[PDB]
Structures are given as structure tokens and as C-alpha cells.
Design a protein around this nucleic acid. Structure first.
Ligand SMILES: [Zn+2]
Length: 228
RNA sequence: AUUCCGGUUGAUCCUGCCGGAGGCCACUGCUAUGGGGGUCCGACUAAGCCAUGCGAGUCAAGGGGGCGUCCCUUCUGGGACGCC
């Protein structure tokens, strides 16, 4: 309910700037599932804040990396902060963002804003040989994701088995909603940005695999939010 | 738990190895209140060398004898009873 009044207040205070913003403010769009899979552009965070207001919860916002960066000038060293952050709701919507600033706080606000703009939609299910239930507690099937030199393979796992994946990967998966998965990684996983983006791509690729209608019943495939 | 993290740069991304983090076995510093179960305790170097004690005996219903007790007939000798 609190997030519902937050959405109401931001809707009252918000003036549209883009076509999608005007559409949402008018009311043609009322569910977050209606902004994806249409080719629209999301350049205004108010849409996310209104349709999926729970992403603003501190428990639902996570910062994955803070990196000091330096560039040389004849007058010395100019120092910048790069903050990699992840946001989303624990029901099938997640997003990852990178923000640059002169201070950690500025970088954090920019990164969270970009993550909100970059939010995506994923599909969950169960496809593990040892589990064979119909609940959306894991990834429906094995998926791949590559960024830089980091390759991440996510495999379904039985219920009760936690996230067998690096810390940042399990943080991203927890934000997305997944809670049981096995991992297989190659490359330099110590590069936090590349690893997080690889996990993001692996989660995103769940929509790039053709499935017959029977597979939905077999694996309990749920797109975006579930029975909630 | 089908996992990672630290380290080449003014800063970035790679390859590559080194180190942390787990289990098991052998020595070892500090320390120690109990009870049960087990197939643990001079294998790693010397299958090197050994004081002393013990670790393979049993059969009297296979045989002839010696010792001692008794019942004795009675110099003879018969029979039981054990021990050597
Ligand atoms: Zn399952």
C-alpha cells in the first residue's frame, strides 16, 4: 500500500515529456508488462516509478561496485567515481545501471536512475531433472550470457538449493526473483562490471528461446510477475 | 554450494601464474572435565642389533616300570587308588 500511495503522489507531481510518458499519465498503459515488447524508448524514470514503485525500496536497490578512476592532466590527477548498481522487484523485473560522477553519492544516484531506465523482463520456471515441479523458483532452462571475456551459464536447480553463483551474480538473481540455480563461468569473473553484465544477459536471454505451448505447462513458465 | 575473491596500470580490458578459502593423513607449540563404540599406536629412516621371561602341547582306555596309601591272603603275592 505504501508503494501505492508513492505511485499516486509521483503520478500527481509528474508532467509527461515523452510519448510513453504522456500515454502512461493519460492512462492507456496501466501494467508494466505493456511497456515492453513494443519497441518503445524509456527515457523517463517516472514511468518505472509509477508502474513498478516497489523498485524504490532500499532493500530492492543494491549497489554492486564502486570504482575509483583517474585521468592525467598537466595539473595533476582528475578522480572520478564509477558506480555499478542493480535495481528491480523480486518478481521478474530487474535492471542494471552504471553511473559516473565526481562523488560517490552522485555516481550512486545516476547509477540507480540508469538501472531504472534499463529495467527488463525475465521468465522463470523449473527445468531441473531432480526437481520437476511447476513453480517459478528457478530459470526454466539452461541459458547463456556473455559480456567482455566473461561467459556465464545458468542451469536450473532443485528447490531449497540456494544460488550457487558468485556474490554479485546471486545479488542480481535475488533482485530478479530467482532463488535456485547452478552456475558455470569462464573468463575473468573478478571484473565486476563484465560479470554483472554477463549475468544480466543470461537472464535476458530467457526470452530468446523458442518454446512450444506444452513446455509452459511442463516447466511452470511464468513471464514477469506470477500469480501475485 | 556444479562459487570465488587479492596481486602487472596514472587509470582500463585480457592472457598467465602465485597466494587465500575446504577435506583427509603424518609430525609438532599451547591447552584439557567425563562416558561409550572401533578393524588405531616403531609402516616412512635400520628386513638394524638384542639381556631376561613367556609364545606347542597332549594321550594312563597302546606298553613295561619306580614311588606312596589302603584291603589284605600272608615270605610268595592279588586288587584297587593316586604321583613320577
Ligand atoms: Zn522445482
Amino acid at each position: 500500500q505504501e508503494w501505492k500511495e508513492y505511485a499516486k503522489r509521483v503520478l500527481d507531481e509528474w508532467e509527461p515529456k515523452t510519448k510513453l510518458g504522456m500515454m502512461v499519465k493519460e492512462g492507456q498503459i496501466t501494467d508494466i508488462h505493456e511497456i515492453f515488447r513494443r519497441g518503445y524508448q524509456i527515457k523517463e524514470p517516472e514511468i518505472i516509478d509509477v508502474l513498478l514503485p516497489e523498485v524504490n525500496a532500499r532493500e530492492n536497490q543494491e549497489v554492486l561496485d564502486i570504482a575509483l578512476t583517474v585521468r592525467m592532466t598537466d595539473s595533476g590527477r582528475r578522480v572520478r567515481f564509477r558506480v555499478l548498481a542493480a535495481v528491480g522487484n523480486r518478481d521478474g523485473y530487474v535492471g542494471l545501471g552504471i553511473g559516473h560522477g565526481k562523488e560517490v553519492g552522485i555516481a550512486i544516484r545516476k547509477a540507480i536512475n540508469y538501472a531504472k531506465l534499463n529495467i527488463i523482463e525475465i521468465k522463470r520456471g523449473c527445468g531441473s531433472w531432480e526437481c520437476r515441479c511447476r513453480r517459478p523458483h528457478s530459470v526454466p532452462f539452461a541459458v547463456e550470457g556473455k559480456e567482455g571475456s566473461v561467459r556465464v551459464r545458468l542451469i536450473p536447480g532443485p528447490r531449497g538449493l540456494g544460488l550457487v553463483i558468485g556474490d554479485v551474480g546471486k545479488k542480481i538473481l535475488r533482485l530478479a526473483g530467482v532463488q535456485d540455480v547452478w552456475s558455470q563461468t569462464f573468463g575473468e569473473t573478478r571484473t565486476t562490471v563484465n560479470f554483472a553484465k554477463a549475468v544480466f544477459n543470461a537472464l535476458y536471454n530467457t526470452n530468446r528461446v523458442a518454446i512450444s505451448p506444452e513446455m509452459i505447462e511442463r516447466y511452470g513458465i511464468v513471464v514477469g510477475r506470477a500469480m501475485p
